[PDB]
Amino acid sequence: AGPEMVRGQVFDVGPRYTNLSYIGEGAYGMVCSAYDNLNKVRVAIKKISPFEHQTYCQRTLREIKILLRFRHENIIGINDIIRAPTIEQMKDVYIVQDLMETDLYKLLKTLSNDHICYFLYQILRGLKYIHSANVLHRDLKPSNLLLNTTCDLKICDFGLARVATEYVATRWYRAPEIMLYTKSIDIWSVGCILAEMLSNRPIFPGKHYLDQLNHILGILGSPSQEDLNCNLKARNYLLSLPHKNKVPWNRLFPNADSKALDLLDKMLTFNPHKRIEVEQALAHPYLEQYYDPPFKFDMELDDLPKEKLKELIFEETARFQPGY
């Protein structure tokens, strides 16, 4: 008679959303599929309970503000947000989004050139929109790329995004300039995704911030001295390691399109300034088939108390009030 429940958890999504079933875990709570009785569509609903860790309030609020402003078919949107009518009763927040049947982290365990071409095209196209907002995503990876039955890709998880040192589970896709940022960070990640779409494994996994580096230097070998010149302690750590050389791209990927290795090569450039930009990557011959034609001082609450963040979250979620 009371609110619906899944796996012993309250999913108090009122009467508008019914027929709840578990579909996995988000960062800060459970994710369920549901039926939107008003718009007659199935949705995904993320339960988020962040109000007792300032970093979880921070990323939740940030992601909401970004997603409520972005509008693009390769970026997940927020259809609705459910929370209590009064701030003091608001312990939970439910974010309602289009139902995507899987993410790319799951999909690469069950690809094709035609598919990789389209996915990569959609990722870059979506990133084109993101960079064009002068936002840095700073967290791209296959699990943040939702996919539906009709081969449509959407980017999600904008918790750690900033306008033009934070723990993350398997921060493998973090760029190397991060070990000492700019939009180059995302192109690096995008490159690491193209690498994994082709090989169904992450060819840069380090059990530690040190092991990571060595997993990179085994492929693009050591860098130019003009790269060491481009943090004192950092460059010295690089000068202390035994030398290693570069590996041709068709050695690790002897089944990959040379067009892909060409574009892949231009994205996995160690130098963050020689690294190709998104709009040049879409223009690459590999994605020729689909080749057709600001916050600024905002989001700036990198350090606010968890109480005022609960205030801003309340304010930002007011555009969906009252619910059905």
Swiss-Prot record:
Q: What is the effect of changing residue 147 to A?
A: Reduced affinity for DCC
Which reaction(s) does the protein catalyse, per the Swiss-Prot or TrEMBL entry?
L-seryl-[protein] + ATP = O-phospho-L-seryl-[protein] + ADP + H(+); L-threonyl-[protein] + ATP = O-phospho-L-threonyl-[protein] + ADP + H(+)
- Which residues carry the post-translational modification Phosphotyrosine, per the record? 167
Quick one: which residues bind ATP? 23-31, 46
* Keyword Ubl conjugation appears in the UniProt entry: yes
One family name in Pfam for this protein = Pkinase
Q: Where in the cell is it found?
A: Cytoplasm, Cytoskeleton, Spindle; Nucleus; Cytoplasm, Cytoskeleton, Microtubule organizing center, Centrosome; Cytoplasm
Keywords linked to the UniProt accession? Acetylation, Apoptosis, ATP-binding, Cell cycle, Cell junction, Cytoplasm, Cytoskeleton, Kinase, Membrane, Nucleotide-binding, Nucleus, Phosphoprotein, Serine/threonine-protein kinase, Transferase, Ubl conjugation
> InterPro entries from the xrefs?
Kinase-like_dom_sf (IPR011009), MAP_kinase (IPR050117), MAP_kinase_CS (IPR003527), MAPK_ERK1/2 (IPR008349), Prot_kinase_dom (IPR000719), Protein_kinase_ATP_BS (IPR017441), Ser/Thr_kinase_AS (IPR008271)
Q: Name where it mostly resides.
A: cytoplasm
Expression sites (tissue/organ): Highest levels within the nervous system, expressed in different tissues, mostly in muscle, thymus and heart.
**Activity modulation comment:** Phosphorylated by MAP2K1/MEK1 and MAP2K2/MEK2 on Thr-165 and Tyr-167 in response to external stimuli like insulin or NGF. Both phosphorylations are required for activity. This phosphorylation causes dramatic conformational changes, which enable full activation and interaction of MAPK1/ERK2 with its substrates. Phosphorylation on Ser-21 by SGK1 results in its activation by enhancing its interaction with MAP2K1/MEK1 and MAP2K2/MEK2. Dephosphorylated and inactivated by DUSP1, DUSP3, DUSP6 and DUSP9. Inactivated by pyrimidylpyrrole inhibitors.
Q: Which GO terms describe its molecular function?
A: ATP binding; double-stranded DNA binding; identical protein binding; kinase activity; MAP kinase activity; mitogen-activated protein kinase kinase kinase binding; phosphatase binding; phosphotyrosine residue binding
What does the PTM comment state? Dually phosphorylated on Thr-165 and Tyr-167, which activates the enzyme. Phosphorylated upon FLT3 and KIT signaling. Ligand-activated ALK induces tyrosine phosphorylation. Dephosphorylated by PTPRJ at Tyr-167. Autophosphorylated on threonine and tyrosine residues in vitro, which correlates with a slow and low level of activation. Phosphorylation on Ser-21 by SGK1 results in its activation by enhancing its interaction with MAP2K1/MEK1 and MAP2K2/MEK2. Dephosphorylated by DUSP1 and DUSP2 at Thr-165 and Tyr-167.
* A Gene Ontology term for the protein's cellular component: postsynaptic density
The cofactor named in the record is: Mg(2+)
Q: Which GO terms describe its biological process?
A: androgen receptor signaling pathway; animal organ morphogenesis; apoptotic process; B cell receptor signaling pathway; Bergmann glial cell differentiation; cardiac neural crest cell development involved in heart development; caveolin-mediated endocytosis; cell surface receptor signaling pathway
Q: Kindly indicate whether the keyword Cell cycle belongs to this entry.
A: yes
Under CDD domains, the record lists: STKc_ERK1_2_like
Q: Which residues form the Protein kinase domain?
A: 17-287
Supply the EC number(s). 2.7.11.24
Tell me the domain comment: The TXY motif contains the threonine and tyrosine residues whose phosphorylation activates the MAP kinases.
**Role description:** Serine/threonine kinase which acts as an essential component of the MAP kinase signal transduction pathway. MAPK1/ERK2 and MAPK3/ERK1 are the 2 MAPKs which play an important role in the MAPK/ERK cascade. They participate also in a signaling cascade initiated by activated KIT and KITLG/SCF. Depending on the cellular context, the MAPK/ERK cascade mediates diverse biological functions such as cell growth, adhesion, survival and differentiation through the regulation of transcription, translation, cytoskeletal rearrangements. Acts as a transcriptional repressor. Binds to a [GC]AAA[GC] consensus sequence. Repress the expression of interferon gamma-induced genes. Seems to bind to the promoter of CCL5, DMP1, IFIH1, IFITM1, IRF7, IRF9, LAMP3, OAS1, OAS2, OAS3 and STAT1. Transcriptional activity is independent of kinase activity.
Family membership: Belongs to the protein kinase superfamily. CMGC Ser/Thr protein kinase family. MAP kinase subfamily.
Q: How does it assemble?
A: Binds both upstream activators and downstream substrates in multimolecular complexes. Interacts with ADAM15, ARHGEF2, DAPK1 (via death domain), HSF4, IER3, IPO7, MKNK2, MORG1, NISCH, PEA15, SGK1, and isoform 1 of NEK2. Interacts (via phosphorylated form) with TPR (via C-terminal region and phosphorylated form); the interaction requires dimerization of MAPK1/ERK2 and increases following EGF stimulation. Interacts with MAP2K1. Interacts with DUSP6. Interacts with ARRB2.
The entry's protein name is: Mitogen-activated protein kinase 1
| Lineage per the UniProt record | Eukaryota, Metazoa, Chordata, Craniata, Vertebrata
Q: Which gene encodes it?
A: Mapk1
